[PDB]
Amino acid sequence: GPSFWLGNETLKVPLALFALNRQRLCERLRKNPAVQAGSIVVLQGGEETQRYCTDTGVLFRQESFFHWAFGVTEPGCYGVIDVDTGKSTLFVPRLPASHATWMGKIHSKEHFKEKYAVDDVQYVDEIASVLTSQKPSVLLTLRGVNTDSGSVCREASFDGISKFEVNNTILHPEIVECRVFKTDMELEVLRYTNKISSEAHREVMKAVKVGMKEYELESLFEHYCYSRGGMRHSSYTCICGSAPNDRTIQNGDMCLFDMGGEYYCFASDITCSFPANGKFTADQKAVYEAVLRSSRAVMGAMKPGVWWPDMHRLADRIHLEELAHMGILSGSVDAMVQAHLGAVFMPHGLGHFLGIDVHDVGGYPEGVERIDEPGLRSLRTARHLQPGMVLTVEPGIYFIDHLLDEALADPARASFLNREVLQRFRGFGRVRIEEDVVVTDSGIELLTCVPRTVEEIEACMAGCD
Amino acid sequence: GPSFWLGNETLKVPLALFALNRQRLCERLRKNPAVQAGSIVVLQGGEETQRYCTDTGVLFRQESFFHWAFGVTEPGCYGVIDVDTGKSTLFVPRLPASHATKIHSKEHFKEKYAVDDVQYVDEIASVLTSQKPSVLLTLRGVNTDSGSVCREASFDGISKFEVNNTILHPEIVECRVFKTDMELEVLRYTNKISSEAHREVMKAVKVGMKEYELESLFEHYCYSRGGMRHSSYTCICAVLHYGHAGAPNDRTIQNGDMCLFDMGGEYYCFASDITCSFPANGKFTADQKAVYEAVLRSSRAVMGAMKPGVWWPDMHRLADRIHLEELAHMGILSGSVDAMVQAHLGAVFMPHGLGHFLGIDVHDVGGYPEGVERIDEPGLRSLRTARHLQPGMVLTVEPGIYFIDHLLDEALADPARASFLNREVLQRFRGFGRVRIEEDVVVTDSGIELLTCVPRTVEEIEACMAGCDKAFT
Ligand code: PRO
Ligand code: PRO
Ligand SMILES: [Mn+2]
Ligand SMILES: [Mn+2]
Ligand SMILES: [Mn+2]
Ligand SMILES: [Mn+2]
Ligand SMILES: [O-]
Ligand SMILES: [O-]
């Protein structure tokens, strides 16, 4: 069948991927006791937007649920799926003559059917008539709460939808659950996005020179991903530690570069930390290797059945052990964990689902509660791991004055801290190591492939090989 | 005073630039007979947005009127200007501690932006109440390129004030139409970097490359060497294969192609908009040279004719006449050029407007103020302004010749036009492609200043693509 492709060495993505997703969604809905026979899923795609009141276009990126279901790149579309049969219909805008003049040929419905391998194509202004003729029991529309943004998903609407029975509660948890588990075809794309972003991270490490501006490396990263990967979008706003990051990379700095390209709306999210000048100091090596250790410990321990908060607390324990070894901390690490001391140095969650969104959906379905403790409350899922899930593993150690100050004021934590040693690490900066992995039947598969050991990084930055 | 700067070789932009804009706006409003004493301008800055319902951030770019007045890069702000004194107050978000996981003081923002006062956003009603203004002047009006209505500032409690939303928009638009010398320094810089990027594209292009490889290179040059985080507009190198101009242009560049790259970077929310046309393989064919030099001729004729008092639609018509003359000299057209012009035949080859205001927006504001009417003729109806030129305006000059099948076929089906076309010669230019030459210029007291600096003659272009140092001529 047909595929998405940007030529050269970019990945060919079969439109069969989205067909499989639709089938999987229907299979799930059919098992839902509340789903009436003759139901039709109705999804509305994204539309082109402009900057404020200007005619300056904003780069269009498809809505994620709609992309997952259809892979459609064009703005202004809808898509529906007959639950009982799986039949898919794409609705495309009916375009005017001036479109031929100003922005190219006007394609038939037949063109779109062939391109997207859907069962039928119609125009958007006919959607009420087409759905009416098919006489559905109910329309299943998308409405739910994203547990990372707090935003409510926007339900599809069209002229005449008021004439239909609409249910907006059933679909969201079911399509979210499908997205949580990646198909082999989806994993191929996420392997590819990780490949290109990994390569771009290597180029950044080779290119960094003291005196450069961070945004120069952000630029290089995006250029590598676009020109070699066909990755037009960054998955997220690029974080370039050491809205352009115009900090000058200084001798002695620890760099932290958190960046990931997106291919055909499939994300990647990778973080590398390394010394700006290519040589770890003793202190930098100590902190860096602590995070390397927790990174590897978590990846190693991950398998179906593991509770993700246990992995977070595993990383905490290891960080505290290493910080104690360094002399920053003293006393019982058991006692330290009881006092939540780990969250002083790692305030964010250990890692998150990744897929079509960087912070992918489904981390907190009904029945899965957020843990109200420091560190853990910032976890973007408290689920147990299962095969097919894609996660970031991103422990880090940070020296954040206001977290440190709070701990030093609190007698339950202040005891553990050696102020004379900690003083040396004020303004140390921060280390984060972020890998993308997939859960397998027995463990994980690592998607990311960048230099990680002190030896590998120093050799890479020195221009070796 | 303070300046915006991204280090290295990037331009230092004094925050005085925005203080001068605030001053000019107040001076205009003071002379406006309908403005009450004690009036206060209230502008609302943009807020951060996310992709749909996700927490994926969209890169924040300040709203243009708010930028023009304040130069503030942070989301979530408001800005107020007391008309009678010119006193400026920035309102900034009160950030929680979790943001530290550094938070700047109000004093830090006051120093950074060289405003008279800074307050937190949640205090705006209290602060304005205490200042006892007569009326709040807010922004509402119609953008004549998008058709959209400018968003009027609002805050909890604004209902307790008298609000006028009609005075400000035409006045602040008119201020934006006329660029200050400080604004011109930024536009010179954006044009310099974008011109250099266009040269790098011409130097790098190889048969067999995808167009988006060149778009990527352009963006990388502008960002890494110019600090231009944003393209000014969606960069044109596909709408066809993926539905939006923003999608990657994934056509493979072929031998014999004519390339058209329309791209321009933005620095600190000041735009550029440049188009270069050139042969993919670095050598103009006789036909390519002919079409190209026709557009070069119209480009230069217009630039040579522009000065204060010139009616912009007359420049569009002048380009039309030159295109038709040259197309006739090529044997694509035959007959009376005067007759062709009467038949609006120029619009067959150049369906768009000759050029447009440029500033903080690529298609900048103020092209159609009250009393200035859109001309309902082919080509001219697409002009983004029908104003007379005055010193301080910044315009693009972007004539082009296109061979667009359905426009040509329509002309061939029209008895009023069909005779002018020689199919025997025209047939050879089907699939020729497109030439557009787009310069950015400033209207001076007596003519123009050219901001753009790219190779333009056939020899200059061929030299650039052959890797000659820019100094070579
Ligand atoms: O948002 C998150 O969960 C991770 C940790 C900080 C950067 N990204
Ligand atoms: O929109 C405009 O005015 C011009 C026409 C060609 C592309 N940009
Ligand atoms: Mn990250
Ligand atoms: Mn992440
Ligand atoms: Mn242009
Ligand atoms: Mn233009
Ligand atoms: O991350
Ligand atoms: O343009």
Using alpha carbons, list the distances in angstroms from residue A217 to A212, A256, A308. 8, 11, 33
- Is A227's CB within 8 Å of B246's CB? no
Task: Give the side-chain half-sphere CA count within 13 A for A314.
Answer: 20
Structure letter (DSSP) for residue B99 = G
What tokens were used for A275?
């010394």
Q: Which residues of A touch B210 (CB under 8 A)?
A: 6-8
User: Pseudo-torsion of CA A453, A455, A461, A462, nearest 10°?
Assistant: -170
Instruction: Write down the residue that tokens 């005055």 correspond to.
Output: B390
Asked if A169 and A145 count as a contact pair (C-beta separation under 8 A), the reply is: no
Does residue A59 sit at the B interface (CB-CB below 8 Å)? yes
Domain B178-473: what homologous superfamily? Creatinase/methionine aminopeptidase superfamily (3.90.230.10)
Exposure of B370 by Cβ count < 10 A (0-12 exposed, 13-18 middle, 19+ buried)?
A: exposed
Nearest partner of B398 among B358, B458, B343, B457, judged by Cα: B358
Q: Look up the CATH number of domain B1-177.
A: 3.40.350.10
Q: Is B63 in the pocket of ligand 8 (CB under 6 A)?
A: no
Q: Is A352 in the pocket of ligand 1 (CB under 6 A)?
A: yes
Residue type at position A217: L
What tokens were used for B291?
């079409």
What tokens were used for A368?
């899965």
From A331's Cα to the closest Cα of chain B, the distance in A is 26
- Residues placed in the known binding site of B for a dipeptide: 241, 273, 363, 384
* Ligand closest to the CA atom of residue A396: 1
Q: Which residues contact A273 (CB under 8 A, 6 or more apart)?
A: A241, A254, A255, A256, A257, A288, A291, A430, A431, A432, A433
User: CA B155 to CA B158: how far, in whole Å?
Assistant: 6
Asked if A60 and B244 count as a contact pair (C-beta separation under 8 A), the reply is: yes
Nearest partner of A247 among A215, A220, A276, A221, judged by Cα: A215
What tokens were used for B445?
């007291």
User: CA B361 to CA B220: how far, in whole Å?
Assistant: 21
Dihedral sign (CA B275, B278, B282, B283):
negative
What tokens were used for B30?
């003071």
> How far, rounded to the nearest angstrom, does the alpha carbon of residue B148 sit from its chain's CA centroid?
17
H or E element: which one contains B274?
strand B274-279
Using alpha carbons, list the distances in angstroms from residue A250 to A254, A308, A427. 9, 37, 13
- Is B245's CB within 8 Å of A103's CB? yes
Q: Which residues of A touch B52 (CB under 8 A)?
A: 46, 63-64, 151, 153-154
Asked if A73 and B243 count as a contact pair (C-beta separation under 8 A), the reply is: yes
- Is B146's CB within 8 Å of A53's CB? yes
Does residue A369 sit at the B interface (CB-CB below 8 Å)? no
Q: Which residues contact B369 (CB under 8 A, 6 or more apart)?
A: B170, B173, B174, B387
What tokens were used for B348?
């067959």
User: CA B356 to CA A141: how far, in whole Å?
Assistant: 44
- Strand ordering across the sheet containing B136-137: B117-120, B88-92, B78-82, B40-44, B136-137, B163-164
- Is B101's CB within 8 Å of A149's CB? no
User: CA B400 to CA A59: how far, in whole Å?
Assistant: 25
From A35's Cα to the closest Cα of chain B, the distance in A is 25
Helix (H, G, I), strand (E, B) or coil at B46: coil
Q: Which residues of B touch A250 (CB under 8 A)?
A: none
Q: How many other β-carbons are positioned within 10 Å of the β-carbon of residue A191?
A: 18
Using alpha carbons, list the distances in angstroms from residue B87 to A20, B41, B113, B114, B464. 62, 10, 13, 11, 51
Structure letter (DSSP) for residue B421 = B
Instruction: Write down the residue that tokens 């001036």 correspond to.
Output: A98
Q: SS3 letters for chain A?
A: CCEECCCCCCCCEECHHHHHHHHHHHHHHHCCCCCCCCCEEEEECCCCCECCCCCCECCCCCCHHHHHHHCCCCCCCEEEEECCCCCEEEEECCCCCHHHHHCCCCCCHHHHHHHHCCCEEEEHHHHHHHHHHCCCCCEECCCCECCCCCCECCCCCCCCHHHCCEECCCHHHHHHHHHHCCCHHHHHHHHHHHHHHHHHHHHHHHHCCCCCEHHHHHHHHHHHHHHHHCCCEECCCCEEECCCCCCECCCCCEEEEEECEEECCECCCEEEEEECCCCCCHHHHHHHHHHHHHHHHHHHHCCCCCEHHHHHHHHHHHHHHHHHHHCCECCCHHHHHHCCCHHHHCCCCCCCECCCCCCCCCCCCCCCCCCCCCCHHHCCCCCECCCCCEEEECCEEECCHHHHHHHHHCHHHHCCECHHHHHHHCCCCEEECEEEEEECCCCEEECCCCCCCHHHHHHHHCCCC
Using alpha carbons, list the distances in angstroms from residue B437 to B201, B262, B298, B403, B443. 15, 9, 9, 15, 18
Helix (H, G, I), strand (E, B) or coil at B314: helix
Nearest partner of B396 among B439, B459, B335, B366, judged by Cα: B439
Phi-psi sector, A386: left (phi>0), alpha (psi -120 to 50), beta: beta
Share in percent of chain B as helix, strand, coil (round to 5): 40, 15, 45
Does residue B244 sit at the A interface (CB-CB below 8 Å)? yes
Phi and psi torsions of A412, nearest 5°: -70, -20
In chain B, where the domains are located? 1-177, 178-473
Q: SS3 letters for B27-42?
A: HHHHHCCCCCCCCEEE
Asked if B1 and B15 count as a contact pair (C-beta separation under 8 A), the reply is: yes
How far, in Å, from the CA of A69 to the mean position of ligand 4?
Answer: 24
Of chain B, the end-to-end C-alpha distance in Å amounts to 40
Helix (H, G, I), strand (E, B) or coil at B60: coil
Using alpha carbons, list the distances in angstroms from residue A213 to A125, B196, B226, B384. 50, 20, 12, 39
Dihedral sign (CA A415, A416, A418, A423):
negative
The residues facing A123 across adjacent strands are: A92
User: CA B291 to CA B433: how far, in whole Å?
Assistant: 10
Instruction: Write down the residue that tokens 């993700």 correspond to.
Output: A308
- Strand ordering across the sheet containing A270-275: A239-241, A254-259, A270-275
Instruction: Write down the residue that tokens 């900034």 correspond to.
Output: B92
CATH topology of domain A181-465: Creatine Amidinohydrolase (3.90.230)
How far, in Å, from the CA of B261 to the mean position of ligand 5?
Answer: 8
Q: Is A436 in the pocket of ligand 7 (CB under 6 A)?
A: no
Q: How many other β-carbons are positioned within 10 Å of the β-carbon of residue A300?
A: 11
User: CA A68 to CA A378: how far, in whole Å?
Assistant: 26
Phi and psi torsions of B200, nearest 5°: -60, -35
Which class does domain A1-180 fall in? alpha beta
Helix (H, G, I), strand (E, B) or coil at B397: strand
Using alpha carbons, list the distances in angstroms from residue A145 to A61, B53, B54, B58. 20, 8, 10, 19
- Is A236's CB within 8 Å of B56's CB? yes
Asked if B233 and B242 count as a contact pair (C-beta separation under 8 A), the reply is: no
Asked if B414 and B378 count as a contact pair (C-beta separation under 8 A), the reply is: no
Phi-psi sector, B337: left (phi>0), alpha (psi -120 to 50), beta: alpha
Q: Which residues contact A443 (CB under 8 A, 6 or more apart)?
A: A300, A302, A303
